[PDB]
Amino acid sequence: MKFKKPPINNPSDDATIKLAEAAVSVSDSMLEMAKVEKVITPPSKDNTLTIPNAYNLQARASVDWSGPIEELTARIAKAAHFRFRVLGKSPSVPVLISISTKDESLAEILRDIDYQAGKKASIHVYPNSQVVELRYAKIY
Amino acid sequence: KFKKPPINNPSDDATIKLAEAAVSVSDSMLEMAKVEKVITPPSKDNTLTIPNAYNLQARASVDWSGPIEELTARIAKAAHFRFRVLGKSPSVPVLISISTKDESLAEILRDIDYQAGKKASIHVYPNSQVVELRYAK
Amino acid sequence: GKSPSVPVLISISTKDESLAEILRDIDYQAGKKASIHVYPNSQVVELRYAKIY
Amino acid sequence: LNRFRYEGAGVVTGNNLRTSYLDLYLANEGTTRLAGNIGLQKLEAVGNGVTQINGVSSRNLQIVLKGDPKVLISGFVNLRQLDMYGKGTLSLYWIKSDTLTIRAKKAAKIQLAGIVNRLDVELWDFAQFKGKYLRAQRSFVKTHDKSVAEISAVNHQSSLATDASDIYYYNLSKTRADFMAFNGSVLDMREWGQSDLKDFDRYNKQFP
Amino acid sequence: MYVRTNLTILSPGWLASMTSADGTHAYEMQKSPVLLVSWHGKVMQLKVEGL
Amino acid sequence: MYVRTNLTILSPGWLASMTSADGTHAYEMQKSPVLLVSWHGKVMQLKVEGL
Amino acid sequence: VPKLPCRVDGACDATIIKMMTDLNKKGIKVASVGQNYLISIPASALFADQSPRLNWASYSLLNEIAAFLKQFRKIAITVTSYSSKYVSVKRERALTLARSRVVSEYLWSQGVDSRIIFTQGLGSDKPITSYTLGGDRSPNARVEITFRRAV
Amino acid sequence: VPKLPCRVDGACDATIIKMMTDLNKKGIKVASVGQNYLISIPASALFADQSPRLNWASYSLLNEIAAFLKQFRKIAITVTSYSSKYVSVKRERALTLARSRVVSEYLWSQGVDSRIIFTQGLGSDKPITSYTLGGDRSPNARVEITFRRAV
Amino acid sequence: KIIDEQLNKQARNLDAIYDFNSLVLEHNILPPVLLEGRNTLNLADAQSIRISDRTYKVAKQAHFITTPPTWRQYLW
Amino acid sequence: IIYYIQAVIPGRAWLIGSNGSTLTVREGSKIPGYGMVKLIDSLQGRILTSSGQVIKFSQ
Amino acid sequence: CFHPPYNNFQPDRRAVKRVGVDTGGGTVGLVASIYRDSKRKIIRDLQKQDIQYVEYGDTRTLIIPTDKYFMFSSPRLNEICYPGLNNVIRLLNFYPQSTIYVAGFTDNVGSRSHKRKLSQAQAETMMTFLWANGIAAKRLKAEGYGDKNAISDNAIIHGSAQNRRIEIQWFTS
């Protein structure tokens, strides 16, 4: 004789309600901008050709890091047992990235690192020589 | 006997909506950076390859931050290779900044070329063991 | 058309009519501000604002 | 040439025979070479015979087997149903169909490759289903004790293992669901050294 | 405010900075009771008083 | 009086008005304690206190 | 004085000592030298035989080991999976990879504030016992957790 | 602050629960899902055989369901009337149209707080069961009221 | 106190969703801030109105930045 | 135009072109627009031919 | 005696163990068993859980909350509410001839393709789960829609929580 409905949770907070109500419109705006930009400029290639995948690079990982990139790439080189190398100089303005994902390939993690780097630094791998080498933007 | 759920599960509906929004905006931003990012082909990559000669595999602890001409002549003399230059020294000298304790001198020269970029370049002949510093016009 | 900034306000009080006459009635009530057309061959009800000024 | 039933240690060789349909019922070592282009719908081998057919193309075919044959057919067949209850081997070159039912009881060595829109697999015991190079839109596989199956699912994959049952997929299905009861196993057995291997996404990241 | 450390200070905006040859960073910036750095990929707060 | 909502104002008039891309409405009128809105075809009066 | 915490929260070193000795009496290998801590578990107390299915009671031991691992300050943990020789190389390589993936996912679900989880499995390439009579009961099949305490 | 109304007048959730349970045991189907509510009444509880006339006993039930519907806050109401095949198609459609019109008129003229009420009927054109043995006693002969609770 | 506790409770999705650091241009410069307006009408007085379809305003100009901001100087 | 791969046995393969045309190819075969296939792969879905292109599956 | 992992996909045997521990009267165990396996107490236990059961005419429908029964943003089936799933199996064993339509629904935020993929994946998950319990593969049809038809508005928080759902419809003949 009782009557219920399916979704029942622990109670909420109105400030969290207002935060989510901002966040939905923010998400829609960002989706709008990204869709229009992708439409107006068509890409040509991708970083898969720059970064292939070889054996021992198929170990898995899950991460949460929010710092300068150098400790992160040194740790991933120590995982891969690869020769780690730098090129150029890190500028006085540091490069900070934030990755919080779940169970990815090392190669896809590195491609995400390059994409979030964008026009500040670039990454390359010589797999046969087993080397991960970065290069900062040699400009300014 | 007992299995627990994850601790910071989004139990609350506001948390559900918020985390979903975060996932959506993360994938959108990664998409936009991907569609705007400029890459380079690994065939047209104007970079110095490894010269893979025998003598270039010594360990050196090198600190320098200044002109490049004395540095390349000094590492050539350390390598017992001949060295010459093709081009003219400009008024403002080419400047570099390299400090390391143990690398290959060959990839050190590769880093010299990479910091040089446009105005300078380097060739190496291993048969007649020479290093050539090529200036730009 | 373009919805103008000044809203177009319609008050209706009527019981037990048909849809077509409701449509014709409110199109008459709008008058010089808008127009309604119906394409029943394509099942499309279309309205238009007034291109004025 | 309508119905051909044979027993008793025969060798028949033929090529360039044109027919709409004929029914073969072979027994007791029929060594057959058929290098023609023949449509047919039914075939029966009683047991303990080896038969290789080069070229069969029909709109339809229904086949069951009873003994221990060693058969292989070349061509394209829109098969529907296949049941194996003995100690049989089978291999087809191409299949272009939509609905496939497979029942395996005792010992089957089946080698198929082609395009099937919907595949159902039942394996009971000592089944060795090598269905690699066989792309499927929908795959539904149920394996009981000591059954090994090799699948190549593309889009929708459903897998169940009771115990001591090996199920090896070979492609990244856009939807994967797997279950094991007592001692089952769902595994990839991929290569990992390819230049263009892709990882999972948020839609198929199922943890066994 | 003048601060010597070896972490990477993020939040309140630093006016100028320099580095040693060994990873020690030197910052000078406005007055704030609070700093916000990155340690090892974890963000940390820093309480400063005594102004 | 500076009023933001997503309703439609009726009675006192206003001097200026603008609308967002989502249907939000922003208005500009003189001092008044009350407002009129046709919310969903139904007339409502809104109380504004503390003028 | 109450404005600064006197210790890292959720830490009592007596309780840490007690749970370490409890795990050693339970039969779980715990070892350390300086800052490098390693713990080793045979796979027979977790999985089915040559299988990536998990017993229900094993979640309790997973809860206990997560409660131990919440104590220290950490950065990167590495979990490796090891097995015996069964059919191929691919079979046990995939088995170790799957087992490492499962234990990594549930560990990440639990609240251990490490920045990095590395998982890898190698199958049967580096055994630690020449006596190879047993199958999955033999202690060469195992899982290892390695990390370094920091400051 | 205290002069503002604490609740919507003429409303109590306990009264809502009690009257919907009474309707449910009375035999009229009550259906609640999300914010959209459905109430369906069999036709022979309201009319005589194939006839667009109201029996005098039906007005008590009509008053009851009107007092139920006034409790919520609505914008749009929709009523549908359905029947069985008798002679024609348009004859049954016209019967449903008349029935829905009559009940819509009475519900409007009673003090319910709707804004817009649509009425239409079709008859046998959208059945709900394969049991067509009964005539106007058949359970598919029905009237449905649907609305959405607005905030 | 409770809302500062809740904002510390939900942490990583907040700086995840408010990525300033991808918004930075090539030369470490904060992009400037723009505002929109749809369907403007203002009446000045009798016999005097002014309408416009879309309006846009620059709020604050672009400049150099030594660090990307966070949400803490907006929400704490 | 392009082609696509359908099923691969070790030695022979099934191919579908852009216009829906079908082919079954040997170890050595001739395809106009692409020439002569030198070798195939059965573990991988790649075809090595005289024109230097590599065929793949649908995405 | 039992296993929490879905009783290892065996035929679940609750009543015989119940009458065994009841005899440890026999008629008391019998009346307890016929109270427990009765459909009314099954529906009431589903109402004690968070599952919505609706019968109307001959079409029978079931509604399951995805946020409760699933790990977040995932096609992973959450393992906590296995008593609810056992109740689901025991109820749906009753009509072994009706075909099954199953569908999934999500809210209104994000990429439409992403919503469609998530709903179709969850639909295939539930379909596979039912397929793993003695149901022939021709008896099912799965579909995952996006936000094509809500039951409550997604601009208010509780309705937005209500909107995503799992829908199970089945017929009679």
Residue numbers in the entry:
A (entry chain GD): 23 to 162
B (entry chain Gd): 24 to 160
C (entry chain FD): 110 to 162
D (entry chain GM): 113 to 320
E (entry chain HH), F (entry chain GH): 311 to 361
G (entry chain GK), H (entry chain FK): 38 to 188
I (entry chain BC): 76 to 151
J (entry chain Gf): 208 to 266
Which of the paper's sentences describe this entry?
Legionella pneumophila is an opportunistic pathogen that causes the potentially fatal pneumonia known as Legionnaires’ disease. The pathology associated with infection depends on bacterial delivery of effector proteins into the host via the membrane spanning Dot/Icm type IV secretion system (T4SS). The Dot/Icm complex of L. pneumophila is one of the largest known T4SSs. The Dot/Icm T4SS has as many as 300 protein substrates, a striking contrast to the H. pylori Cag and B. pertussis Ptl T4SSs, each of which transports only one virulence factor.
Using 3D variability analysis, we reconstructed a total of five maps that displayed differences in the way the outer membrane cap (OMC) and periplasmic ring (PR) were positioned. These maps led to the identification of an approximate 16-fold symmetry about the center of the dome positioned within the OMC. Within this dome there are 16 α-helices that appear nearly identical at this resolution. Indeed, a model of the C-terminal domain of DotG generated in Swiss Model using VirB10 as a template fits into the resolved dome density. However, we have unexpectedly uncovered that the Dot/Icm incorporates only 16 copies of DotG into the OMC dome out of the 18 DotG copies in the PR, giving rise to another symmetry mismatch within this system. Based on the structure of DotG modeled within the PR (residues 791–824) and the homology model fit into the dome density (consisting approximately of residues 857–1046), we hypothesize that DotG extends from the PR to the dome, though a physical connection between the two structures is not observed. (A) Two DotC were observed in the maps that were reconstructed during 3D variability analysis, one which contains an N-terminal extension (DotCLong) and one which does not (DotCshort). In contrast, the N-terminal extension of DotC was modeled as two relatively large helices positioned near DotG and bridging adjacent asymmetric units. Notably, this portion of DotC was only observed in either four or five of the 13 copies of DotC observed in each map. The movie shows that the OMC dome, OMC disk, and PR of Dot/Icm T4SS can accommodate various orientations in relation to each other that suggest that the complex could undergo a ratcheting motion, in which the dome and PR rotate back and forth about the central axis with the different regions of the complex tethered together by the physical connections across the symmetry mismatches.
